[PDB]
Amino acid sequence: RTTRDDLINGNSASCADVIFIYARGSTETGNLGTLGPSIASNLESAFGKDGVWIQGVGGAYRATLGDNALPRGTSSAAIREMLGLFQQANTKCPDATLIAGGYSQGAALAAASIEDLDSAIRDKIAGTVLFGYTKNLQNRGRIPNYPADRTKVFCNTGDLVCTGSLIVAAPHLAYGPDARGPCPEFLIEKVRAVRGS
DSSP, X not given: OOOOBHHHHOOGGGOOSEEEEEEOOXXXXXXXXXXXXXXXXXXXXXXXXXXXXXXXXXXXXXOOGGGGGSTTSSOHHHHHHHHHHHHHHHXXXXXXXXXXXXXXXXXHHHHHHHHHSOHHHHTTEEEEEEESOTTTTTXXXXXXXXXGGGEEEEOOTTOXXXXXXXXXXXXXXXXXXXXXXXXXXXXXXHHHHHHOO
């Protein structure tokens, strides 16, 4: 449901082929929030329960609304938490293909973490999805140091956070359909592009 710690709980002896690390939006519950569960279910359908590990960013990431105003769009502690998860994935399952995603503050967190990530690990992320990307205008729809072809941004018309503001309007809460279809579609495609099948 809203909490998944497949990576942390997982046995190194039987690593999944795909590891998905996701950061929730502000004030959302568990470590997956409102959109994470939908993405997870679809990933499981494609790769099978044992084929993919779903890991939300919990720990120090409190998804505090006020942190959207900090320089990177989230807290330093949150970035360290997500970086640590990528590092854990790399160590626990070196042969797994990674995919990532984030919504709202989680999107900023995903961008910041990926930017700071060691290139060797960053290069293992076959695709990243960002919903209501709070740094969309500032970063010109990109994630620093990460290829455009591996990036997909879902920014609704009227979603003010995609246009340089921190105002939360109705379109910012309308990403359900995207999380159910195009998002997993993109992630699956990106994984298959490098892993074949």
